Design a protein around this ligand. Structure first.
Ligand SMILES: NC(=O)OCc1ccccc1
Ligand SMILES: [Zn+2]
Length: 260
């Protein structure tokens, strides 16, 4: 209730460390993925994304992005395999995007910034609840997917069309029966490394799994994202754009590739 961080000049990423010292920690995210340095790891098991039973409930503008929330009270949509030990339950997804097509993603690939990045957030069921999971080094598994501007992503349109109803911070709308399988690329090849939440509290509880294949969305689709507001209703309008944290020091970490 007293947080004041954001993405502006005075409360942006370079200021976060004052209230969240872990911002200068040993396993912060995002990071630049150097494709030539990432090493193929034969020990990685096949990745398993099981979203057939996913049941979405609502979409919320929280002042820094919009979250499509899922009912995680039962074992439905789960992520397992790959570098993960155990089962991780889908709780929400959201995006980070830019003011221009040349920027917006959090992770970068050989310093390349994509127009946006989708984060599907899952928590380790062995910890019982999300709140407990974020206090553990292996509490969350976040599937990151890059977005590039080109052809439209049909499966994203239902999200785009509901944004008019959650323009400002604090607004929410019912959002049932949305199938997240429609946001996945063809290939599940990925890079993985141990990291953190990319927004305060920046907790170091995430196993990051970043897909190599981006999905394509249309210019009209991302333009709608850019009409959202960081501000609440009846406040000076500040477009919700460039809500991404830049790449952080890799420090003592190795990025592993699931392929080639
Ligand atoms: N951006 C980012 O770190 O997404 C992952 C995440 C996990 C848990 C809560 C919020 C966000
Ligand atoms: Zn995110």
């Amino acid at each position: 209730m007293s947080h004041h961080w954001g993405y502006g000049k005075h409360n942006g990423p370079e200021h976060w460390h004052k209230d969240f010292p872990i911002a200068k920690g040993e396993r912060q995210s995002p990071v630049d993925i150097d494709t030539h340095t990432a090493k193929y790891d034969p020990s990685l098991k096949p990745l398993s994304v099981s979203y057939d039973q996913a049941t979405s409930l609502r979409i919320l503008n929280n002042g820094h992005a919009f979250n499509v929330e899922f009912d995680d009270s039962q074992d439905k949509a789960v992520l397992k395999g790959g570098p993960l030990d155990g089962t991780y339950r889908l709780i929400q997804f959201h995006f980070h995007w830019g003011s221009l097509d040349g920027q917006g993603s959090e992770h970068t690939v050989d310093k390349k910034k994509y127009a946006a990045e989708l984060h599907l957030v899952h928590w380790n069921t062995k910890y019982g609840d999300f709140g407990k999971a974020v206090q553990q080094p292996d509490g969350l598994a976040v599937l990151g997917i890059f977005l590039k501007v080109g052809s439209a992503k049909p499966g994203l349109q239902k999200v785009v069309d509901v944004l008019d109803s959650i323009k400002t911070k604090g607004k929410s709308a019912d959002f049932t029966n949305f199938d997240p399988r429609g946001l996945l690329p063809e290939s599940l090849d990925y890079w993985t490394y141990p990291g953190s939440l990319t927004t305060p509290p920046l907790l170091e509880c995430v196993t990051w799994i970043v897909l190599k294949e981006p999905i394509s969305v249309s210019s009209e689709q991302v333009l709608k994202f850019r009409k959202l507001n960081f501000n609440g209703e009846g406040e000076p309008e500040e477009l919700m754009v460039d809500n991404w944290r830049p790449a952080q020091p890799l420090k003592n970490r190795q990025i592993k590739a699931s392929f080639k």
